[PDB]
Ligand binder design. Structure first.
Ligand SMILES: O=S(=O)(O)OC[C@H]1O[C@H](O[C@H]2[C@@H](O)[C@@H](CO)O[C@@H](O[C@@H]3[C@H](O)[C@@H](OS(=O)(=O)O)[C@@H](O)O[C@@H]3COS(=O)(=O)O)[C@@H]2OS(=O)(=O)O)[C@H](O)[C@@H](O)[C@H]1O
Ligand SMILES: [Cl-]
Ligand SMILES: [Cl-]
Ligand SMILES: [Cl-]
Ligand SMILES: [Mg+2]
Length: 577
């Protein structure tokens, strides 16, 4: 077992880490840093081609690459790691044990463009903004905004854009995603720019506008990428910035995120923490635990545990099938391997039909995968059918965690195993707890079968411009399948406290078995209703839904909209009338 210790010696700690890690020999490694501020530039960092799920594949500059260890541990001892430019901070590949603790990750210059809106003129089609200085970087060239101008990199445009409250640093009431692609930006002095373009929906005056950049290149790498690893623990790990997601896990087992978080540094002038999901679990298995954590100010979901839906392309023989990935950012994923159990899904039935076990895998390219099974393939297997990995599905538990003030759903649950969401504080612009089985555009599996959401606090939920709800069960499946079959099952929403401004509470679609009990709804938020006459609960094409011992306080609101199919099995004790 080797133990490497480091001090803040040089202004760029990348070459020292690269050389020390390159000469490691044993399979048990521990790295200790004396508490200080370490800076890492990508200029002299190692470069490898990487396949990153829900990110863009390509050549990556990597600061910490740890591959093949029996156990690897990184002790930061409260150190702060400052990164620069387009770089991947940490990569943990093929490790039977991973532990990172007591560390803070940030960038010297963030890859965002934040500006305060001064005035908006919809008639002429321009907006006057004052960019926040802080540690942001930007300039003008060719009548176009260039940012962040780090190591010669700059996005073509501001890209997708959102309005934020300057005081609370959260998405504004009724805020929606803007897309800024302006070609004419003027400098009026005063540190004020006039951006010429006719937006569909303009940001409010006084709000702060966030911009991540071009959609094609802003997902460079997550702060942490864990691939094919087991027994991973993150303890007291804070992420202030990342050119992508915060914690990304691919095909891993027994993951723990404790006392960690992704949020803004207090006293700073930053608006966004991570440009993508805070935590992400793609086809993991074993157990996943998130406890005593805090995720805010991300540009995407707080958590998404899900698997991959692959599409049958061709039948090779009686035991071999070739599948294709559905989403462009899913190509290169390690879908399956030997001894994996796989669910077969035949059009137009959305349910898991049969199970088979993989014998071998022949990867043709990043898009197509040839799978040979131990048993005979289903006789009805045809092109367009789906494969879902049965082995790689985790149990999920999120408790005593804070998720607020960011642009997405709070928690997205797509695992068929036992899921427990308890004792959390939640606040979401969009839906808070979302279920979206997707075979239309994202191809993310996870029809659920055991989910429990109890004793949580929901405050200021679903204040986006588009309609949402605290608990939103809305699968989006390909039209090659029937659109009225039961998809999700056995979801319980118990003993929660919802502070409402007039938002939907529960919107269920194709749920089989849904218990909404013991909840207290408090109409105590002084915010205007964005979708008038929206009911607390709406159910469509569902079965065996039960309302029981719920309480509503405040101004009256429409209670229930239900289709004739789910009404035949709905149990309503009239606790809210
Ligand atoms: O199946 S889902 O759980 O619903 O989605 C899986 C992905 O979730 C994350 O990213 C998407 C998520 O934030 C979603 C929430 O509504 O919005 C998506 O945006 C898409 C488009 O990508 C976006 O255009 S652009 O190219 O990003 O500029 C815009 O058209 O809005 C849509 C849908 O949003 S909405 O209907 O207006 O509410 C997010 O896509 S993404 O930001 O481009 O990645 C997650 O980060 C993904 O990896 C998937 O897990
Ligand atoms: Cl060097
Ligand atoms: Cl790779
Ligand atoms: Cl009650
Ligand atoms: Mg990718």
């Amino acid at each position: 077992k080797e133990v490497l210790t480091f001090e803040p010696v040089a202004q760029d700690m990348t070459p020292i880490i690269r050389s020390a890690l390159k000469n490691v020999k044993d399979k048990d490694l521990k790295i200790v840093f004396k508490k200080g501020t370490y800076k890492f530039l990508p200029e002299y960092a190692s470069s490898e081609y990487r396949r990153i799920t829900n990110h863009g594949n390509g050549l990556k500059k990597i600061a910490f690459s740890l591959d093949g260890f029996d156990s690897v541990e990184i002790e930061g001892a409260g150190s702060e790691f400052v990164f620069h430019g387009q770089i991947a901070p940490f990569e943990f590949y093929n490790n039977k044990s991973v532990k990172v603790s007591n560390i803070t990750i940030d960038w010297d210059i963030p890859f965002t463009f934040v500006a305060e809106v001064l005035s908006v003129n919809e008639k002429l089609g321009y907006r006057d903004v004052r960019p926040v200085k802080g540690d942001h970087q930007w300039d003008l060239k060719g009548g176009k905004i260039r940012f962040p101008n780090v190591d010669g990199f700059s996005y073509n445009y501001l890209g997708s854009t959102l309005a934020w409250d300057k005081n609370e640093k959260r998405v504004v009431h009724g805020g929606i995603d803007s897309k800024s692609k302006s070609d004419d930006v003027e400098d009026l002095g005063n540190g004020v720019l006039r951006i010429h373009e006719r937006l569909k929906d303009y940001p409010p005056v006084g709000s702060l506008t966030s911009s991540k950049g071009d959609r094609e290149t802003h997902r460079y790498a997550p702060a942490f990428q864990v691939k094919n690893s087991k027994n991973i623990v993150f303890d007291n790990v804070v992420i202030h910035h990342a050119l992508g997601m915060g914690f990304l896990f691919e095909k891993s087992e027994d993951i723990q995120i404790l006392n960690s978080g992704v949020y803004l540094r207090d006293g700073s002038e930053r608006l966004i923490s991570t440009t993508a999901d805070a935590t992400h679990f793609a086809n993991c298995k074993g157990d996943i635990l998130i406890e005593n954590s805090r995720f805010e100010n991300m540009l995407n979901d707080g958590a998404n545990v899900h698997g991959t839906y692959t599409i049958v392309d061709k039948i090779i023989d009686s035991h071999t099938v070739m599948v294709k990935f559905g989403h462009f950012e899913q190509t290169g994923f390690e879908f399956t391997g030997q001894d994996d159990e796989i669910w077969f899904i035949h059009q137009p039935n959305t349910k898991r039909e049969s199970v088979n076990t993989v014998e071998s895998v022949n990867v043709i390219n990043e898009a197509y995968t040839q799978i040979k099974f131990k048993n005979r393939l289903p006789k009805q297997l045809a092109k367009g059918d789906l494969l879902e990995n049965k082995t790689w599905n985790p149990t999920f538990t999120m408790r005593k965690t804070i998720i607020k003030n960011h642009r997405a759903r709070n928690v997205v649950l797509k695992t068929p195993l036992k899921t427990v969401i308890e004792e959390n504080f939640f606040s979401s612009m969009m839906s808070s707890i979302l279920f979206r089985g997707e075979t239309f555009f994202w191809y993310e599996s996870g029809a659920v079968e055991d989910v429990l959401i109890r004793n949580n606090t929901f405050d200021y939920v679903a204040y986006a411009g588009k309609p949402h709800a605290v608990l939103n069960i809305t699968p989006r499946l390909s039209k090659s399948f029937n659109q009225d079959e039961i998809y999700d099952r056995n979801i319980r929403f118990e003993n929660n406290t919802i502070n409402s401004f007039g938002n939907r509470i529960v919107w269920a679609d194709r749920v089989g078995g849904l218990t909404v009990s013991g909840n207290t709804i408090n109409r105590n938020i002084n915010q205007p209703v964005l979708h008038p006459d929206s009911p607390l609960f709406e159910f469509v094409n569902s079965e065996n839904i039960e309302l029981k011992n719920n309480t509503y306080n405040g101004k009256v609101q429409r209670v229930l909209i239900v289709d004739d199919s789910s009404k035949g099995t709905l149990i309503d004790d009239g606790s809210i009338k």
